[PDB]
């Protein structure tokens, strides 16, 4: 669990803190990454290995990790900051744990495609397939984060980039089966058995690393997202 | 000279003498130089000569 | 330098005797002969390997002896269709494979495949460029060999590559250096070969094969006298194109 | 046996430098620590040193 305040606030052209602080086990000998998603879009990474960010995000946004804490700086915030921000860390337990989410309130190609909803079914079973093309799918890793409607982000699987080891959440353990295709590029998630609790949209991550967080603890990083299928899962 | 646990203690002192013959009458101390960080069982020294 | 040449020429023997063909060498090798048989036609097939162990698929009838500078084969068993030349190769000097005018025997008087491609007339325009391709074993562990055969000459070597594992250098022959470059392509598992500056004896019909495996380390538990050796560590002959010169 | 490291080749097969560090608690006396921090020298005033 990664403590996390649920709502901040800040005025245009002044400088915010985001901390997001946790245990010893998985923000202190790991590194955290940041995320923001846009109301009704899909997340983007934005702090890397702490020290480090991507072409896509500008300079403007300061992070760093002081023991076990991380804080998230917005150093001049505009009005299009107004989104939910994650921390991400990955606990030697083989989980990977998110954050709570900011609500920063203001007071002024790569292509990730997934399908398969409708009828869930919850007892029976059913297909959930992600493509993918254009980025070098043998190298780059994947994973599985869901996000219920009003609620976080949940992390379901993850499959390293050779097809080898893969690991399972604590409350999916046991019932998903995640495989991948080398020749046909796509991204296959076997869901059996789905509880009335797993009303989310299933977002298909993609991983900037090649084998799992395990061994690369300083590496590992979801930049390009994708529009997950909302599933209907009811009585 | 010692041989302590941790530390060599190398002492030294550089005194005047004029009377030539042999170890002079006077009372001088040895003011520590360099203690040697090194842990060795020595049992035996040699002096070098040119 | 090692010439091996064979004793027998035509053995024209009836079905239902025994046969004998004897080969010698001028020095003194080790237990590094190795039996083929070649249809005509076809492609040749290693019959026995190290003079110790046979192969696997061929019957039992090919029972072989000999060691040091004498070597020879004991079929005591009926020909049923073993209308075939039976060649011989020393396995001793790996960057000198060479082969002997093996004797034509008369009657009286599999997921592993490889294909070629490249042939036709060669006067007009001296530079050829053949193939490779391989869709059985996995391409990059093994070395690729190549092996021509001149019109009722027999068996010549030409030159390997090595694999990618014991350095990528090469080594051809004394009539080939310098006008035959091989290069391989493991990123697409096709092997190629450059023909530059050919010439009228260069006619032959060229065959690529495997080599020796670079990880040992399955060679170690299993021993050398079963079909797993002979599956996974040893050469695979396949098909053979044609070259055509005028004037 | 040789790698045989290329560019043309995709992530996993590319050279990975590892600098792997170890520490041992021998006999003899630690001559590596750690940086010391230090602190601003005060003047006469009833503080801990």
């Known amino acids: 669990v990664l403590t996390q305040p649920p709502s901040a606030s800040g005025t245009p052209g002044q400088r915010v803190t985001i901390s997001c602080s946790g245990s010893?086990?998985?923000?202190?000998?790991?590194?955290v990454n940041w995320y923001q998603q846009l109301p009704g879009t899909a997340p983007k990474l934005l702090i890397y290995?702490?020290?480090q960010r991507p072409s896509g995000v500008p300079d403007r946004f300061s992070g760093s990790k002081s023991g076990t804490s991380a804080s998230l700086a917005i150093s001049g915030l505009q009005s299009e900051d107004e989104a939910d921000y994650y921390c991400?860390?990955?606990?030697?337990?083989?989980?990977?744990?998110f954050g709570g989410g900011t609500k920063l309130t203001v007071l002024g190609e790569v292509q990730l495609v997934e399908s398969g909803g409708g009828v869930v079914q919850p007892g029976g079973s059913l297909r959930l397939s992600c493509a993918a093309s254009?980025?070098?799918?043998?190298?780059?890793?994947m994973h599985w984060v869901r996000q219920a409607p009003g609620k976080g982000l949940e992390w379901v699987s993850v499959?390293?980039?050779?097809?080898?080891?893969?690991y399972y959440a604590d409350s999916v353990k046991g019932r998903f089966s995640i495989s991948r295709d080398d020749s046909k590029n796509s991204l296959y998630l076997q869901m059996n058995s789905l509880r009335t609790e797993d009303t989310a949209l299933y977002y298909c991550?993609?991983?900037?690393?090649?084998?799992?967080?395990?061994?690369?603890?300083?590496?590992?990083?979801?930049?390009?997202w994708g529009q997950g299928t909302t599933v209907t899962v009811s009585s | 000279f010692k041989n302590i646990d941790g530390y060599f203690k190398i002492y030294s002192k550089h005194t005047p003498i004029n009377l030539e013959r042999d170890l002079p009458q006077g009372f001088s101390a040895l003011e520590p130089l360099v203690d040697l960080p090194i842990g060795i069982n020595i049992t035996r020294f040699q002096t070098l000569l040119a | 330098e090692i010439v091996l040449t064979q004793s027998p020429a035509t053995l024209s023997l009836s079905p239902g005797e025994r046969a004998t063909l004897s080969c010698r060498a001028s020095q003194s090798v080790s237990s590094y002969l190795a039996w083929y048989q070649q249809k005509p036609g076809q492609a040749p097939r290693l019959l026995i390997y190290d003079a110790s162990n046979r192969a696997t698929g061929i019957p039992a009838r090919f029972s072989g002896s000999g060691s040091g500078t004498d070597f020879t084969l004991t079929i005591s068993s009926l020909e049923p269709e073993d209308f075939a030349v039976y060649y011989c190769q020393q396995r001793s000097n790996w960057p000198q494979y060479t082969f002997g005018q093996g004797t034509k025997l008369e009657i009286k008087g599999s997921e592993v495949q490889l294909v070629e491609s490249g042939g036709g007339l060669v006067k007009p325009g001296r530079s050829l460029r053949l193939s490779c391709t391989a869709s059985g074993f996995t391409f990059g562990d093994y070395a690729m060999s190549w092996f021509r055969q001149a019109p009722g000459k027999g068996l010549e070597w030409v030159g390997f590559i090595r694999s990618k594992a014991y350095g990528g250098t090469t080594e051809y022959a004394a009539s080939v250096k310098g006008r035959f470059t091989i290069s391989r392509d493991d990123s697409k598992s096709i092997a190629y070969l450059q023909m530059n500056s050919l010439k009228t004896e260069d006619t032959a019909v060229y065959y690529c094969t495997r080599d020796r495996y670079a990880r040992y380390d399955i060679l170690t538990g299993l021993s050398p006298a079963g079909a797993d050796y002979f599956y996974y560590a040893m050469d695979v002959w396949g098909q053979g194109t044609t070259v055509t010169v005028s004037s | 046996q040789s790698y045989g490291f290329r560019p043309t080749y995709g992530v996993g097969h590319q050279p990975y430098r590892v600098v792997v560090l170890s520490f041992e608690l021998l006999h003899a006396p630690a001559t590596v620590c750690g940086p010391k921090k230090s602190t601003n020298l005060v003047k006469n005033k009833c503080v801990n040193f």
């Open positions: 991550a993609k991983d900037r690393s090649y084998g799992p967080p395990d061994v690369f603890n300083y590496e590992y990083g979801m930049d390009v």
């Open positions: 254009g980025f070098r799918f043998d190298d780059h890793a």
């Open positions: 290995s702490n020290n």
């Open positions: 991400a860390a990955w606990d030697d337990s083989l989980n990977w744990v």
């Open positions: 499959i390293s980039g050779d097809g080898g080891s893969t």
């Open positions: 010893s086990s998985n923000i202190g000998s790991n590194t």
